[PDB]
Amino acid sequence: TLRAAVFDLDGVLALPAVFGVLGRTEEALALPRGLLNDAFQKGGPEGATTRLMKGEITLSQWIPLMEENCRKCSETAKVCLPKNFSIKEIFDKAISARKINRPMLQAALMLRKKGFTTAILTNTWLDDRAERDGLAQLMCELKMHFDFLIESCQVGMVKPEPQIYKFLLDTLKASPSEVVFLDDIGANLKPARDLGMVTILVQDTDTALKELEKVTGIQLLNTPAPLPTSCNPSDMSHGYVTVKPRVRLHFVELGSGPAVCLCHGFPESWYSWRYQIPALAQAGYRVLAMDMKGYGESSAPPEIEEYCMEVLCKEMVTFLDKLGLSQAVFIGHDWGGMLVWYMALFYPERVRAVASLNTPFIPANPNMSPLESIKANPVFDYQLYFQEPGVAEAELEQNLSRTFKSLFRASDESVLSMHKVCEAGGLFVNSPEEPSLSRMVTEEEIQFYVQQFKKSGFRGPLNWYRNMERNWKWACKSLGRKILIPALMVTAEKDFVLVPQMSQHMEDWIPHLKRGHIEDCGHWTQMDKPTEVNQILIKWLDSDAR
Amino acid sequence: TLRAAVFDLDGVLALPAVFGVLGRTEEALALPRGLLNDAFQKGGPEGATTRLMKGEITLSQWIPLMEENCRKCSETAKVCLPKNFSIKEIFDKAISARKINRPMLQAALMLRKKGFTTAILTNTWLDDRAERDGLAQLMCELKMHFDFLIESCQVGMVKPEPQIYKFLLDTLKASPSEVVFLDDIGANLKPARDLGMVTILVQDTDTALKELEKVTGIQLLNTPAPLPTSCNPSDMSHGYVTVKPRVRLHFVELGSGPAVCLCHGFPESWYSWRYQIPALAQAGYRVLAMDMKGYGESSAPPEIEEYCMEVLCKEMVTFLDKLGLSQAVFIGHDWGGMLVWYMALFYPERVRAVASLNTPFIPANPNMSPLESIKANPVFDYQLYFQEPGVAEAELEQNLSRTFKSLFRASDESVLSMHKVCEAGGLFVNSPEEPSLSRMVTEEEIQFYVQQFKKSGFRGPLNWYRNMERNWKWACKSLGRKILIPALMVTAEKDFVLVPQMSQHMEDWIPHLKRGHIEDCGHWTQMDKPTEVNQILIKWLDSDAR
Ligand SMILES: O=C1Cc2cc(C3CCCCC3)ccc2N1
Ligand SMILES: O=C1Cc2cc(C3CCCCC3)ccc2N1
């Protein structure tokens, strides 16, 4: 029975094969068939290419050796290479054209999800070309999804030598009959077949995957669209910044490029962005996913005033100062969405771009108490229930597992009646003691929120709602302003509190506003519809935030 | 007696004054004198400019209001503005041309160093222009050096209104007679003078500084060249990455731009880079100053093999993987310098550029034991003393304060005889019990190293020297390679162990190698000669690493 899957890189996990380019160059340049391929494999196990794949020499040392082999092969065949023939140019283009074979990666991810140990086994080189970052990015993206990456130039062994196969088996801690091996080179399949491994000659991906599902008994072809890559908390870079003597802010950090600061809502975590963090980093951004003040590993002071918008925004400005960031793009959800619109109004020089999920920008009414306003809309009653210190903490902290299982549900799965929460006496009065697991979350994801909220509970988080009067007074100073920096508003069709129609007048205050809209999406936008959130944010970041 | 110094931004801390540009534009365009200045101050306390400085409106909302005032002023004066007249263009250029007045900043730094509370008090705007980052960068660089930054648009008050002065006094917790106030606008000096504050009308910086030193009794003009900005550990962003189950790596992070990874030597800390971190971040780089494995907040496993070059390099590759960095520029010193040359040889795709301070690249001799080699040179004897587990730990951990005070000394201050350390019985046998403080370090800086080394001691650090045979075997695999990625070798004239002449043959293995050389510099390069280290690294980063 199989428990390990091994994939080659070129022609298997990455397409088109760099190898296929030598054949193409010959044809484009009307050179004799297999001339470039013959010069490439010249000297066999003693040749430049073998020394290169074993890590004896680097790619830049190999370029002149290949050019010389092309000369010898050319001389013998009584032909001539054109004046502008560049091995460097041919390979730069080939390596640059090679992209991940997404369906092969998805099959590898599915096998790993079902308990398989996965590995990449490749004949590769030490790339010291000025344009080496392109391939370094490709390897970074690919490798994260596998248990092992075995590279010939690092191990000093090459396919088809039998030793690399014995090395692979030892790395996998598996007998050859427990391993399926996919390669596009028949010669490289042989030794694995010889040991007793299941082998798949990969020509077209589709047939290889039919062969792969036939031998594993796991469906890999025609499967539903997969969820974006998520985060394992223990595999992230964790950052800590002291913004004032008693306040430290925690964040998770992934990627290089423009800083994208993610601001969660109530009662959440940096982990609410788990499906966006790998996607935004892969799209070319430096992601900073915050634990907002009162949450997770960030400080949670008890005082109500510590959570007014003015204080929260000032601390986020200090957070940037301490990291040496002149700006960040600010992306918020729910309470984080409210914070990001205020960051844009009061600190435009520090905000590269602003985006909000569900939370619209509504300017303070100077003629109405913020309290009067909340009372008018029956959907906002839960916020009045939150006013009295201790009441909501008691109910929310009673059983953490039940709290997050009852809250984190899709639009249909809703177990809570938010109509007269106060009169009913609580949020969970008609909710089961043991709520069923929503299709949006696993038991493990719930347990992460449970463990996070064990540190400070719900006081600091609830205090975000206990500054209605302070926030309103501060917001009134901005009544003559407009948001004129790049801005994105993302509405969710099925958010029954933060309804799409609440955002309808935003163009009066943000004239250049861009929009996104998500069908069949509830309040928990990021985990409800991860794929669409990522697609909307990536598209807007690439056009408006660089 | 004075204990507080207050500086204006425009025409005081930053030059040329943006105000002076309106006068210049009038002259360049042959417009009537004071036309642009008259349109700028139009309506006085009720005008657009006052609303802008109070934070009522943003700079982009103000641009059209200013254009209209220019039209009215123009009409009255029976003149005409040319077809291509752009307020936006004039201000974009003015703000962009405005740089920090370095001697004014240095005086402010000197006053703060001598116990003064310092503040910036400015009439400024909420900048929402597409080019706002330029000024955000300027404010970030300036503000870090002051106790307070008071901005009119944030406080809703403006100079010369008396309330902003009373606000300033309350922020400073100082009576007006304890405050010196520097401003380039006589009208804005008046209210501070009226309260009893010492005021300085700033025209030319030099005269203002003579007036400033006359009233403070502190020398500010003609003082020695100041040391670069250093790091306060508690004010940094601290990062933590788990690279394997029992290994976590700690780093300090500052700046945006290409990742620059700093690798210290033995027996050091991320803090050995304190004078480079703010400079490299200010030069446009994302600095990652490491605590190397065995040091500070990084894990320190006991096993010798955990510290061989192969393991250390692999973990640094994983460190990049976990942060989502396809590459970093690697800059090392002493043992970190050795690690960076090996990062370049074995992982060129992950290394954007490589630089070393003191440590040359010398290829392994396959015909000589690494032990034989070390013994041949009497300067390397201290490494033989380090071989036996426990001996050097006992001497180095005995009294931490004495250890760092004896080690961290300039070339002349040297208290250690490194000639036959073994025969003498130890490094500190002829060293005093209470060494004097070197001119390179304060008592506080020593105490930081003392507290850092209290966690894991010297075992993990000493283990870096206990893998001579493992390292040599691994290095021998690279004997056919060349370093062809951008590389910088920095020699230190007075390093008696890592002598400049040991680097003489490096061009045979790194043909495109760049060099730096530091006169009168010992082994502790970064703190011995901070200014010159920064100048050499910044110049090489801007030309070779982007
Ligand atoms: O459709 C929905 C469901 C929903 C739930 C909530 C919660 C957040 C946690 C505390 C109680 C209120 C807020 C908005 C919406 N919008
Ligand atoms: O000029 C010099 C002084 C000096 C001192 C050292 C130390 C480092 C700590 C452990 C003992 C050896 C190494 C090189 C040099 N080069």
Side-chain angles (χ1 to χ4, degrees), chain A residues 339-395:
Chain A
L339 180 287
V340 306
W341 297 122
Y342 286 83
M343 281 297 296
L345 274 170
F346 288 83
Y347 302 100
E349 44 277 279
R350 301 295 219 131
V351 184
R352 181 104 88 227
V354 59
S356 176
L357 305 188
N358 305 39
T359 309
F361 171 70
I362 294 146
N365 183 331
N367 309 308
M368 250 234 258
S369 274
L371 190 295
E372 283 196 82
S373 312
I374 266 96
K375 288 200 176 142
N377 199 351
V379 304
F380 293 136
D381 181 68
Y382 78 90
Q383 308 198 11
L384 297 168
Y385 172 64
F386 287 175
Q387 299 307 292
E388 182 48 41
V391 184
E393 289 89 328
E395 194 197 12

Side-chain angles (χ1 to χ4, degrees), chain A residues 183-461:
Chain A
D183 204 310
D184 66 323
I185 297 176
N188 301 339
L189 255 345
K190 293 166 91 313
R193 193 255 302 126
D194 239 89
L195 247 34
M197 296 190 225
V198 174
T199 64
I200 292 156
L201 175 63
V202 178
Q203 288 187 24
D204 64 294
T205 298
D206 235 282
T207 311
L209 293 186
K210 296 156 203 161
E211 285 183 45
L212 186 56
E213 62 172 21
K214 175 90 74 175
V215 293
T216 59
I218 297 160
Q219 181 168 279
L220 309 166
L221 235 16
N222 318 314
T223 59
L227 282 184
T229 306
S230 181
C231 292
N232 174 197
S234 71
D235 284 347
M236 313 304 290
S237 179
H238 289 268
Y240 308 84
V241 181
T242 299
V243 294
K244 69 172 90 131
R246 308 194 59 202
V247 192
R248 164 193 95 164
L249 298 177
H250 171 250
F251 67 103
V252 152
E253 196 174 32
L254 193 70
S256 54
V260 181
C261 182
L262 309 181
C263 302
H264 67 75
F266 174 95
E268 305 180 69
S269 169
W270 68 264
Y271 197 60
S272 278
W273 300 104
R274 70 200 171 270
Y275 298 109
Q276 288 65 61
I277 303 147
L280 305 189
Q282 196 54 51
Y285 298 93
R286 174 195 182 169
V287 184
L288 308 157
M290 308 298 306
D291 262 334
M292 302 301 284
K293 197 194 188 164
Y295 294 94
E297 303 181 56
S298 283
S299 303
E303 302 84 9
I304 284 162
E305 321 75 48
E306 273 301 285
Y307 304 86
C308 72
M309 284 280 114
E310 188 180 10
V311 169
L312 293 167
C313 290
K314 256 163 209 203
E315 286 170 359
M316 285 305 297
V317 164
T318 305
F319 174 81
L320 293 188
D321 294 338
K322 302 218 188 180
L323 262 156
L325 303 175
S326 58
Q327 302 186 322
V329 5
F330 278 89
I331 310 184
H333 170 257
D334 180 82
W335 261 119
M338 198 82 271
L339 180 287
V340 306
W341 297 122
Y342 286 83
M343 281 297 296
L345 274 170
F346 288 83
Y347 302 100
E349 44 277 279
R350 301 295 219 131
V351 184
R352 181 104 88 227
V354 59
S356 176
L357 305 188
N358 305 39
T359 309
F361 171 70
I362 294 146
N365 183 331
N367 309 308
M368 250 234 258
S369 274
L371 190 295
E372 283 196 82
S373 312
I374 266 96
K375 288 200 176 142
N377 199 351
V379 304
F380 293 136
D381 181 68
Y382 78 90
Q383 308 198 11
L384 297 168
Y385 172 64
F386 287 175
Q387 299 307 292
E388 182 48 41
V391 184
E393 289 89 328
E395 194 197 12
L396 299 161
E397 291 159 15
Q398 206 279 133
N399 177 348
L400 296 177
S401 181
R402 180 203 188 198
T403 285
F404 300 105
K405 278 178 178 178
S406 310
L407 296 168
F408 303 164
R409 319 203 57 102
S411 45
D412 44 304
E413 293 165 334
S414 291
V415 106
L416 307 187
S417 343
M418 275 168 295
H419 267 189
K420 240 316 187 264
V421 167
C422 312
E423 141 195 335
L427 255 336
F428 310 137
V429 303
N430 302 289
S431 164
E433 260 306 305
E434 286 184 316
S436 71
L437 197 61
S438 164
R439 57 195 164 77
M440 296 204 303
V441 290
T442 64
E443 185 52 41
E444 291 71 49
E445 290 166 335
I446 292 291
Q447 290 310 305
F448 181 81
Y449 286 89
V450 169
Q451 297 318 294
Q452 290 300 286
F453 282 79
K454 253 161 195 179
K455 182 195 165 183
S456 315
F458 287 82
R459 191 177 177 157

Side-chain angles (χ1 to χ4, degrees), chain A residues 483-539:
Chain A
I483 293 170
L484 304 152
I485 65 158
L488 175 76
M489 177 68 207
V490 189
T491 55
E493 189 202 352
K494 300 182 177 174
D495 194 324
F496 308 115
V497 174
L498 294 172
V499 306
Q501 223 121 244
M502 286 187 21
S503 78
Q504 80 193 326
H505 304 304
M506 283 177 71
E507 283 88 352
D508 300 336
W509 323 106
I510 317 161
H512 318 296
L513 182 68
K514 291 211 180 173
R515 290 180 176 269
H517 182 72
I518 320 181
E519 302 273 66
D520 191 51
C521 186
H523 180 72
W524 318 98
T525 315
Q526 309 101 303
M527 59 168 137
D528 194 323
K529 290 289 171 290
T531 310
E532 29 284 289
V533 165
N534 298 356
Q535 170 267 307
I536 292 164
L537 300 173
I538 293 164
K539 176 196 155 208

Side-chain angles (χ1 to χ4, degrees), chain B residues 266-267 334 358 379 382 386 396 407 409 411 414 416 418 427 465 494-498 522-524:
Chain B
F266 174 95
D334 180 82
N358 305 39
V379 304
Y382 78 90
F386 287 175
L396 299 161
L407 296 168
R409 319 203 57 102
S411 45
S414 291
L416 307 187
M418 275 168 295
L427 255 336
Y465 292 94
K494 300 182 177 174
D495 194 324
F496 308 115
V497 174
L498 294 172
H523 180 72
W524 318 98

